[PDB]
Design a protein around this nucleic acid. Structure first.
Length: 1289
RNA sequence: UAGUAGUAGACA
C-alpha cells in the first residue's frame, strides 16, 4: 500500500521557445572553451608559468631528499644469512671503529658499533638465536636487539638523538624551476644515478624460455638494480623484524655484502600502533647505486676508501612495506613495458632500453613520496590534452605548476614532462622514459600509467588530507547559500523559467536549472519511453517493492553506515548490520522499502565523509549516510535504474560486458555515417556536395558535481513516462527526492580535534568553521552527495543531450548532421557529425549569406567550423540544467584514441592489468599459507583476464609465489619446508601443508585454484586402487588429517587454522541458544530468514562469527604481528585445541599419515570428491601448437564471458511454517521445487543424506575474432602464448 | 636544513 503523496502538474513548456532562444544565442560570436593545440602555445604556457612559479614559491638553494634508502653495491649480491650477518657485522664494526666521526650521526653510529663490538660471548649467543632458545641478558633483552645506555653515548650522539626527538603561516620553499643551471644539475644527478643502476655487476615454458627469459630476465639479472633490489629487500626485512612491540624500543645493528653496507636501527615507536616511524641510518662504501651525496650526513674517508653515512630516516609502515617489494614492483612494471613495446613494434626491445626502463621503474619504486605521485597523476591527463586538436591544456599546465619542486628528482621529471609535452604538441609518439618512438597513443599512455601505479595509495599526510576532504562540500554549500540568498529559495529550488532567462541571461549557471528545460528533456526521453511502456512498467514492478527491507544482503552488509548523533554531537560510525539489528530489535515486523520510508520519512538526512585512500593528487572522500537516507536513496535509485535500463545512450545501467559492445556499436555507426555524402538542396536545382566529418568530444564532469540542484530530478520524475496506471510510486519517488534536498553534514572527529588543538585560526580555517553552527554539523542543500544518484543524473544528462539534438535539428533542418551520445560513468562521449565544403565552397559561403540575409540570423555560426557551434549550443543546453562541462579535462579530437583510453580506464572490466599485477604482492589477507597463496594466484588470473600476456602473468605468479613461500618459510632450505618432516616430495605435498603451489598460469586460469590438490587426491586414489603401495598410500592420510583439523577461499580437502588478531547486539543471545537454533534450522544456511522474529537471531548469528568479525578489521598496522610471528616461526597454527607451530603440525601430520588405515568410508568419500572434481587438463594436455610464418596483428579490445540450488536444498530442509514460507518467498518458481529436488537427488544417486548435500553445495578482454565459448577463450590464450610469433592451433 | 608530510598548525 503506497500512501498518497502530492504530484506536480505539468507546465506549458514549448520547444518553440527554446528553438527561438537558441536562434538568438547563436546569432552572435560564441567563444570556444578550448584552445588549439600548438607546440608554440604549449611552450609559451610553460615559459610563462616558470616565471610565475619563481614568483609564487620562495627560492630554496638546497635540493631536498628523495631517496628513502641509500646504499651501493659493487659485487654480486648473496642473500643474507645469520652466520653471514654475524661475520659482516664484526668486519663492518672493525671498519667503522677505524674511522673518525664528524657529525652527530657519525658519532651515533660510532657509539653503536663500539657497543656492538664489545658485547660478551653470551650476548652474541642470544643476539643471533631464534626465539626458541633465546634467554634474556643484561645487554640483550630481545633477540635481534641490544641496549645502548645514555652513559655509552657521547655529547654529539645525544645531540642527534634529541634533535630527532624534538606553523600557522609559512610558504613552502621550492627550487628555481626556471633556472637552467638547476635543471642541468638535477638532470646530471638523476642521469648518474640511473646509469649506476643500469651498470652490469609445457608450451608456455618453452615460449617463456625463448622470449621472456631471453630478452628480459637474462638482461636484467646482471644489472646493478637487480642486486640493489635484493639488498633492499634484506634491509627492509631487518627493519620489519625490529618493528615489533617488544623490540622497537631497542638498538639494532645489521651488516650486508661482506660488511660493505651497515644498518643502524635506533629506538622507535612500534609499527603495530598507527602513525609510527622506524628510524635508521645506513653506512655504505661509496660506489654505484642509490647514492645522493648532497643528502648524505657525511662521507668518512680512510685511505682511498670513502664511507657514506646517511641521514636518519623515519619510514612508516606503508612506505616500508612498499620498499620491501620494490624489486618485484620494478620487475612487473618492466615486464608490462616489455609486452606493450612488443605489441606496438612487433619486435623485442633492445638490451639498453630494457635496462634503462628497469632502472627508471626501480628508482620510482624506491622513491615513494607523494610529490612524485602527484606529478605522475597530473601527467595522465596532461598527455591527452596535448595530443588532441582542442583541449584545456593551459589550465592543466597551470595546475602542474601549482606545486613546489623540492628535490632533484622532481625537477628531472618536470624537465622530461616539458620536453615530452612540447614534442607531442608539435606532431609518432615519443616515449617518456626511453629514446623509442611509438606508433600508438595507447603505448605512451600505458607507459605513464605503469609509472603512476608504482606509488602506493596512502602517501598523503593524514591531517592535511583529512582537512582537505571537507573543503569542496563546504565551499559549494556556501555557494548554494549565496545563490539562494541572491535569487530566493523558491527560484533556486524550483528553477527559473525561460522568460526569466531571456530577461536576465545570467541565470544560466551551476546550481540553477530551467523548469522548461527539465520538462522538455523529460518529453524528449518520453519520445522513446512511450513506445516501450510495457517493458518499462515490468522493469519498475520487478524491483520487488513489497519484500521485507532487511531480508536483502545489501541491507545487512558489513559496509559502514552512520548511526545516531552522540552526546558530544558527532555522528556515530557504525555498520549496516548493526543498524539493521537495532531497528529489528526496536519493532515487531519486517517492513518493506515503502513501509520503511513511511516510518522514517520525518527524520533528517545525515552524512559524514571518510578518506578513500587513493593515489591521486587529491584524495577523494567517501560519504557515509544514515538508515533513512539509505532507504530514500534506494527508492530513488531503484526507480531510476529500472527506468534507465531501457535507454540506449545511458551506459551506467549496463552490466559491463554490454557496455563495451554498446560503445563499439556507437563508434561503428558514427564511422558508417561519415562514409556517405551530404547534399544541400537549392531552389535552382543546383545541389552543393558537402563532405561529412566527425569530431569526438570526451566531455568531463557530466554526471556528478558538488555544484548541482537535486531538485531538478523532482520535475524530471514527475514528467517521466512509466507504464504504471497510477502516480503512487512516482509520487513516492518525488517525495523521497524532496526528503534528500537538505542534509546534515558532520565533520569527522579527527578534523574536529585537529582544529581544536589550534590556538589562533587563519581566515580560511575561520570561513570553513563558520559552516558548522554547533561546530559539528552544517546543512547542505541542492548538492546530493557523491555516489548516491548515478542512474538518475546519467539519465538526466542523456535527456539533456537529446534535447540539444532536437533543438539543433529544428534550427537547421537543411543540414544533415549526426549525433551520438554515450553518458558512461562520470564522463561522456559526444560525436558531432558536421559538413565541410568540398572544393573552395564557393557556393557554400554564398548559400550561408543568402540564409542570413533571408532572416535566419542563426546561420552565421554555421559558416565555418560548425562543430564548434554545435558544441557551444550543446554546452549551453547542458548548462540550462546544472551540468557544466569541465574546461580542463575535456579533449576535442578527430580520432577516438583519448576517449577510448579514458573509457577503458573507467570500465571496471578493462582496468590496466599492471594495476592488478602490482596488487598481488601487497595487501594479501594475512591468514595462512594456503589462503595467501590462493589470494595471490587469483589476482594473476584476473590480470590475464584484463589483458596480461601469459608470459607476463606467469612471471608475476612466480614472483608472488616466491614472496608467499618466503613469508611462511615453505620454500626449500628453510625449517618450515614440509619435505623435512613428511616423507614425500615437495610437489607431492598438499598445498595446505607446505607443498609446491607454483603452477602454470593456464592451469590456474582454466582449472582454477586448488587443481593441484585435486590432481594430488585423484592420483592418490589411483595409486591406492591400482598399486596399494606403502609410501604411495602415505599421501592418503595427510588429506584425512586436514579434515580432522577442519572438522575440529574454499579448500577442497581441509586446511590449517592460523591465529587472527582482532558489539552492542552481539551478546543479547546466549551462544548455546545460537548453536541450538542453528542446529534446528538448517534450511536457513542457504536462504535468509525473512520474518523479524527469527531474522534477528539470524543476524546476531551473523555477528557472532569469526569470519565476520575478522572482516570488519582488515586494514590495520597490527596485521604486521601475524607476519612477524610467521617469519619468526612462533605458535601460529591450531592443533587439538592448542596453539602450536607449523613444525608441530607437520610432525603430527607425519605421524597420522604413517598410522593411517583405510576403512572404505574414506575411500567412498574420496571417490565422491574426485567425481566432484570440465576436464580442462585433457584439453590442455591434448592440443597441437606450431608456428606459421606470419606477423602478429593486434585488433580492438573485445569483452567476452568465461564460464536455484540453495532454494531446492532449503526447500528440502524446511519443516515449520516460517521456514517453508521463507523458502517459497525466496524461490522463483515454488511449484517446481519438488520436481527440481527429485531430479537433483536422482542425478546425485546416479552420480539424500544432509551432510553430503551440505558438503557438495568472469569477463575476459580478448580480440574481436574470439567467440563466447570458454574453448574459444582458451584457444585465444594459447595462440597469444608468444609475444612476437603467430601460433596455429 | 633529521625523516615523512605540507603552501591547515602533524607525527612529537
Amino acid at each position: 500500500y503506497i500512501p498518497d503523496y502530492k504530484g506536480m502538474e505539468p507546465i506549458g513548456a514549448n520547444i518553440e521557445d527554446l528553438v527561438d532562444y537558441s536562434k538568438d544565442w547563436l546569432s552572435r560570436a560564441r567563444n570556444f572553451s578550448f584552445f588549439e593545440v600548438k607546440g608554440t602555445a604549449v611552450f609559451e604556457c610553460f615559459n610563462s608559468n616558470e616565471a610565475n612559479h619563481c614568483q609564487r614559491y620562495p627560492m630554496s638553494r638546497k635540493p631536498r631528499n628523495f631517496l628513502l634508502i641509500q646504499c651501493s653495491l659493487i659485487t654480486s649480491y648473496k642473500p643474507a644469512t645469520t652466520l653471514s650477518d654475524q661475520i659482516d657485522s664484526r668486519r663492518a664494526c672493525s671498519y667503522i671503529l677505524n674511522l673518525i666521526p664528524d657529525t652527530p650521526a657519525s658519532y651515533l653510529i660510532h657509539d653503536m658499533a663500539y657497543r656492538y663490538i664489545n658485547l660478551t660471548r653470551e650476548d652474541m649467543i642470544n643476539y643471533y638465536a631464534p626465539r626458541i632458545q633465546f634467554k634474556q641478558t643484561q645487554n640483550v633483552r630481545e633477540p635481534g636487539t641490544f641496549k645502548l645506555t645514555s652513559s655509552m653515548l657521547r655529547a654529539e650522539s645525544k645531540a642527534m638523538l634529541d634533535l630527532l626527538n624534538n606553523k600557522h603561516g609559512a610558504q613552502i620553499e621550492s627550487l628555481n624551476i626556471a633556472s637552467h643551471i638547476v635543471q642541468s644539475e638535477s638532470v646530471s644527478l638523476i642521469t648518474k644515478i640511473l646509469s649506476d643502476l643500469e651498470l652490469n655487476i609445457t608450451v608456455l615454458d618453452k615460449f617463456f624460455q625463448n622470449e621472456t627469459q631471453k630478452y628480459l630476465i637474462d638482461v636484467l639479472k646482471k644489472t646493478t638494480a637487480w642486486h640493489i633490489g635484493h639488498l633492499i629487500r634484506d634491509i627492509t626485512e631487518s627493519l620489519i623484524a625490529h618493528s615489533g612491540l617488544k623490540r622497537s624500543k631497542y638498538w639494532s645493528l645489521h651488516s650486508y655484502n661482506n660488511g660493505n653496507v651497515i644498518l643502524f636501527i635506533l629506538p622507535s615507536k612500534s609499527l603495530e600502533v598507527a602513525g609510527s616511524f622506524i628510524r635508521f641510518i645506513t653506512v655504505f662504501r661509496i660506489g654505484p647505486g642509490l647514492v645522493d651525496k648532497d643528502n648524505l650526513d657525511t662521507i668518512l674517508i680512510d685511505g682511498d676508501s670513502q664511507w657514506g653515512v646517511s641521514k636518519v630516516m623515519s619510514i612508516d609502515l606503508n612506505r616500508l612495506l612498499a620498499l620491501n617489494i620494490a624489486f618485484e614492483k620494478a620487475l612487473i612494471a618492466t615486464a608490462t613495458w616489455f609486452q606493450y613495446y612488443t605489441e606496438d613494434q612487433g619486435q623485442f626491445p633492445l638490451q639498453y632500453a630494457i635496462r634503462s626502463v628497469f632502472a627508471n621503474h626501480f628508482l620510482l619504486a624506491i622513491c615513494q613520496k607523494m610529490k612524485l605521485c602527484a606529478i605522475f597523476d597530473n601527467l595522465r591527463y596532461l598527455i591527452p590534452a596535448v595530443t588532441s586538436l582542442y583541449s584545456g591544456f593551459p589550465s592543466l599546465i597551470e595546475k602542474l605548476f601549482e606545486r613546489p619542486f623540492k628535490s632533484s628528482l622532481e625537477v628531472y621529471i618536470y624537465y622530461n614532462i616539458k620536453s615530452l609535452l612540447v614534442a607531442l604538441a608539435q606532431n609518432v609518439y615519443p616515449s617518456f622514459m626511453s629514446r623509442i618512438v611509438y606508433k600508438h597513443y595507447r603505448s605512451l599512455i600505458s607507459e605513464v600509467t605503469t609509472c603512476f601505479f608504482l606509488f602506493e595509495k596512502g602517501l598523503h599526510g593524514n591531517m592535511n588530507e583529512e582537512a582537505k576532504i571537507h573543503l569542496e562540500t563546504v565551499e559549494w554549500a556556501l555557494k548554494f547559500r549565496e545563490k539562494e540568498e541572491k535569487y530566493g529559495e523558491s527560484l533556486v529550488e524550483n528553477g527559473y523559467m525561460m522568460w526569466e532567462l531571456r530577461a536576465n541571461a545570467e541565470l544560466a549557471e551551476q546550481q540553477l536549472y530551467c523548469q522548461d528545460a527539465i520538462e522538455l528533456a523529460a518529453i524528449e526521453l518520453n519520445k522513446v519511453l512511450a513506445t516501450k511502456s510495457s517493458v518499462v512498467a515490468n522493469s519498475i514492478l520487478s524491483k520487488n517493492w513489497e519484500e521485507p527491507y532487511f531480508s536483502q544482503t545489501r541491507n545487512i552488509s558489513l559496509k559502514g553506515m552512520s548511526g545516531q548523533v552522540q552526546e558530544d554531537g558527532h555522528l556515530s560510525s557504525s555498520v549496516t548490520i548493526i543498524e539493521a539489528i537495532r531497528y529489528l530489535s526496536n519493532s515487531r515486523h519486517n517492513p518493506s522499502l515503502l513501509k520503511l520510508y513511511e516510518e522514517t520519512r520525518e527524520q533528517k538526512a545525515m552524512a559524514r565523509i571518510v578518506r578513500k585512500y587513493q593515489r591521486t593528487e587529491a584524495d577523494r572522500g567517501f560519504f557515509i549516510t544514515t538508515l533513512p537516507t539509505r532507504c530514500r536513496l534506494e527508492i530513488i535509485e531503484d526507480y531510476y535504474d529500472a527506468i534507465a535500463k531501457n535507454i540506449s545512450e545511458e551506459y551506467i545501467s549496463y552490466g559491463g560486458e554490454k557496455k563495451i559492445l554498446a560503445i563499439q556499436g556507437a563508434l561503428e555507426k558514427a564511422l558508417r555515417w561519415a562514409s556517405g555524402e551530404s547534399f544541400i538542396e537549392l531552389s535552382n536545382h543546383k545541389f552543393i556536395r558537402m563532405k561529412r566529418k566527425l569530431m569526438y568530444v570526451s566531455a568531463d564532469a557530466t554526471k556528478w558535481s558538488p555544484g548541482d540542484n537535486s531538485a531538478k530530478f523532482r520535475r524530471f520524475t514527475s514528467m517521466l513516462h512509466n507504464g504504471l496506471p497510477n502516480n503512487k510510486l512516482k509520487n513516492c519517488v518525488i517525495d523521497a527526492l524532496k526528503q534528500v534536498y537538505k542534509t546534515d553534514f558532520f565533520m569527522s572527529r579527527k578534523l574536529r580535534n585537529y582544529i581544536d588543538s589550534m590556538e589562533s585560526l587563519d581566515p580560511h580555517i575561520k570561513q570553513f568553521l563558520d559552516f558548522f553552527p554547533d561546530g559539528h554539523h552544517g546543512e547542505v542543500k541542492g548538492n546530493w552527495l557523491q555516489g548516491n544518484l548515478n542512474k538518475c543524473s546519467s539519465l538526466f544528462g542523456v535527456a539533456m543531450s537529446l534535447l540539444f539534438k532536437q533543438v539543433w535539428t529544428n534550427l537547421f533542418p537543411e543540414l544533415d548532421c549526426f549525433f551520438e551520445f554515450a553518458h558512461h560513468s562520470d564522463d561522456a562521449l559526444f560525436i558531432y557529425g558536421y559538413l565541410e565544403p568540398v572544393d573552395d565552397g564557393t557556393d557554400w559561403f554564398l548559400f550561408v549569406s543568402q540564409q542570413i540575409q533571408a532572416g535566419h540570423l542563426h546561420w552565421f555560426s554555421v559558416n565555418t567550423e560548425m562543430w564548434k557551434s554545435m558544441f557551444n549550443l550543446h554546452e549551453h543546453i547542458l548548462l540550462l540544467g546544472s551540468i557544466k562541462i569541465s574546461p580542463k579535462k575535456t579533449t576535442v579530437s578527430p580520432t577516438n584514441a583519448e576517449f577510448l583510453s579514458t573509457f577503458f580506464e573507467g570500465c571496471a572490466v578493462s582496468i590496466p592489468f599492471v594495476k592488478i599485477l602490482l596488487g598481488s604482492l601487497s595487501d594479501l589477507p594475512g591468514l595462512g599459507y594456503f589462503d595467501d597463496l590462493a589470494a595471490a594466484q587469483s589476482r594473476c588470473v584476473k590480470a590475464l583476464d584484463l589483458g596480461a600476456s601469459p608470459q607476463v602473468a606467469q612471471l608475476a605468479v612466480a614472483l608472488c609465489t616466491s614472496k608467499v613461500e618466503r613469508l611462511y618459510g615453505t620454500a626449500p632450505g628453510m625449517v618450515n619446508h614440509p619435505a623435512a618432516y613428511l616423507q614425500v616430495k615437495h610437489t607431492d605435498t598438499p598445498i595446505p601443508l607446505g607443498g609446491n603451489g607454483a603452477m602454470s598460469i593456464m592451469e590456474l586460469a582454466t582449472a582454477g585454484i586448488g587443481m593441484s590438490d585435486k590432481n594430488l587426491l585423484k592420483r592418490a586414489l589411483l595409486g591406492y586402487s591400482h598399486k596399494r603401495q606403502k609410501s604411495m598410500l602415505y599421501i592418503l592420510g595427510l588429506f584425512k588429517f586436514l579434515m580432522k583439523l577442519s572438522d575440529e577461499q574454499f579448500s577442497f580437502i581441509g586446511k590449517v587454522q592460523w591465529k587472527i588478531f582482532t558489539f552492542e547486539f552481539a551478546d543479547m543471545y546466549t551462544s548455546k541458544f545460537l548453536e541450538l537454533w542453528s542446529s534446528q534450522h538448517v534450511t536457513y544456511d542457504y536462504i535468509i530468514p525473512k520474518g523479524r522474529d527469527n531474522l534477528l537471531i539470524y543476524l546476531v548469528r551473523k555477528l557472532n562469527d569469526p569470519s565476520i568479525v575478522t572482516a570488519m578489521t582488515m586494514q590495520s598496522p597490527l596485521q604486521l604481528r601475524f607476519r612477524m610471528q610467521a617469519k619468526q616461526h612462533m605458535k601460529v597454527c591450531r592443533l587439538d585445541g592448542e596453539w602450536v607451530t607449523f613444525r608441530e603440525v607437520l610432525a603430527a601430520a607425519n605421524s597420522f599419515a604413517e598410522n593411517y588405515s583405510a576403512t572404505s568410508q574414506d575411500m567412498d568419500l574420496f571417490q565422491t570428491l574426485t567425481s566432484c572434481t570440465y576436464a580442462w587438463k585433457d584439453f590442455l594436455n591434448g592440443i597441437h601448437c606450431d608456428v606459421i610464418p606470419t606477423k602478429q596483428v593486434q585488433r580492438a579490445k573485445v569483452a567476452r564471458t568465461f564460464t536455484s540450488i540453495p532454494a531446492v536444498i532449503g526447500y528440502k530442509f524446511a519443516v515449520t511454517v516460517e521456514e517453508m514460507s521463507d523458502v517459497l518467498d525466496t524461490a522463483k518458481f515454488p511449484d517446481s521445487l519438488s520436481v527440481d529436488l527429485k531430479t537433483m537427488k536422482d542425478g546425485v544417486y546416479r552420480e539424500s543424506l544432509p551432510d553430503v548435500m551440505k558438503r557438495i553445495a568472469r569477463v575476459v578482454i580478448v580480440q574481436g575474432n574470439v567467440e563466447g565459448t570458454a574453448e574459444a577463450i582458451c584457444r585465444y590464450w594459447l595462440k597469444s602464448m608468444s609475444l612476437v610469433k603467430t601460433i596455429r592451433v
